[PDB]
Swiss-Prot record:
The active site is at S70, H222, N246. This is Calpain-3. Belongs to the peptidase C2 family. Isoform I is skeletal muscle specific. Residues 17-305 form the Calpain catalytic domain. Homodimer; via EF-hand domain 4. Interacts with TTN/titin. Interacts with CMYA5; this interaction, which results in CMYA5 proteolysis, may protect CAPN3 from autolysis. Interacts with SIMC1. Interacts with UTP25; the interaction is required for CAPN3 translocation to the nucleolus. Calcium-regulated non-lysosomal thiol-protease. Proteolytically cleaves CTBP1 at 'His-409'. Mediates, with UTP25, the proteasome-independent degradation of p53/TP53. It is found in: Cytoplasm; Nucleus, Nucleolus. It is linked to Muscular dystrophy, limb-girdle, autosomal recessive 1: An autosomal recessive degenerative myopathy characterized by progressive symmetrical atrophy and weakness of the proximal limb muscles and elevated serum creatine kinase. The symptoms usually begin during the first two decades of life, and the disease gradually worsens, often resulting in loss of walking ability 10 or 20 years after onset. Muscular dystrophy, limb-girdle, autosomal dominant 4: A form of autosomal dominant limb-girdle muscular dystrophy, a myopathy characterized by proximal and/or distal muscle weakness and atrophy. The age at onset is variable and can range from the first to the sixth decade, although later onset is less common. LGMDD4 is characterized by onset of proximal muscle weakness in young adulthood, gait difficulties, increased serum creatine kinase, myalgia, and back pain. Some patients may have upper limb involvement. Disease severity and expressivity are highly variable.
Length: 307
């Protein structure tokens, strides 16, 4: 069939913007169950200087919109902790300012092989803003486009409503997903999680809802990304910590080790820097290992295939 390269070249020669026949910018690509609201617009119509990737592809670029696909977004965020893996999914040679023909592509691991998914860059908007996933930088479009490509792989945006983080992790790595009930967690699980993150394995977690917020700042039935583990010295003892990211890009733990916790004052300025401590409402936060195990019920690890 026609490769991305073939289609891209063709559009450039005809000086036309690609329109995807198989996943067109209309209601069919949005939903399946019902017929029901959004204007489709390409990023150069949304803003004056759109960019595919600004300041690197990282986890601050993944902010959930009006679609319940946290399971997928938590996994993208995890993937950005591992830049060399990330660039297999997101081909870097793509631009709005050079050889632009309104066509992009992404690679996913599917039937024991990398498959290429091609999309046009039309995206759902309302009042000229993205309604679905966006970057916290208003001119950056890779994450919105990746979501679109993944929606195409599943037939519609609506098909991304509900899923398991481990499905996305496998689709991005070709690794093998493993589950832990935190209830049955062994004594050394801090160490297990630490070794996994250092190995570049993707890790997500959630609080089971038997399938809007909690007082402590956590969200039930919601995929979080595990983005770090570390030990800090605090009042003469070493304290084990866990870092998580809510793929909403906001709404955080408000307990100990949270952003605004006063007893951060007792931590040395260099240690703060090593932990990348920042008081910012970005969805990312430290919490104690002890509080983590106490609130979270499910931990999912995707182990990279021993090449
Ligand atoms: Ca970025
Ligand atoms: Ca924060
Ligand atoms: Cl660009």
């Amino acid at each position: 069939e026609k490769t991305f390269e073939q289609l891209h070249k063709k559009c450039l020669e005809k000086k036309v913007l690609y329109v995807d026949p198989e996943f067109p910018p209309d209601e069919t690509s949005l939903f399946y169950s019902q017929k029901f609201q959004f204007v489709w617009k390409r990023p150069p119509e949304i803003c004056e200087n759109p960019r595919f990737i600004i300041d690197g592809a990282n986890r601050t670029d993944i902010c959930q919109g009006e679609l319940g696909d946290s399971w997928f977004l938590a996994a993208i965020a995890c993937l950005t902790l591992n830049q060399h893996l990330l660039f297999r999914v997101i081909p870097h040679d793509q631009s709005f300012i050079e050889n632009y023909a309104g066509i992009f592509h992404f690679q996913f691991w599917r039937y024991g092989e990398w498959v290429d998914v091609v999309i046009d860059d039309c995206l759902p908007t309302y009042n000229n803003q993205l309604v679905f996933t966006k970057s916290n930088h208003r001119n950056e479009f890779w994450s919105a486009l990746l979501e679109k490509a993944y929606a195409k792989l599943h037939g519609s945006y609506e098909a991304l409503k509900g899923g398991n983080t481990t499905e996305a992790m496998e689709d991005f790595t070709g690794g093998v997903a493993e589950f832990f009930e935190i209830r049955d967690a062994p004594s050394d699980m801090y160490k297990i999680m630490k070794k996994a993150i250092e190995r570049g394995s993707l890790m997500g977690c959630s609080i089971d809802d038997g399938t809007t917020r909690m007082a402590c700042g956590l969200v039930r039935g919601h995929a979080y990304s595990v983005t770090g583990l570390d030990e800090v010295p605090f009042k003469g003892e070493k304290v084990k910590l866990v870092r998580l990211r809510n793929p909403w890009g906001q709404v955080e733990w408000n307990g100990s080790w949270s952003d605004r916790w006063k007893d951060w004052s007792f931590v040395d300025k260099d240690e703060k820097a090593r932990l990348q401590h920042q008081v910012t409402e970005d969805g990312e936060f430290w919490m104690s290992y002890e509080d983590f195990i106490y609130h979270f019920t499910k931990l999912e690890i995707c182990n990279l295939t021993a090449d």
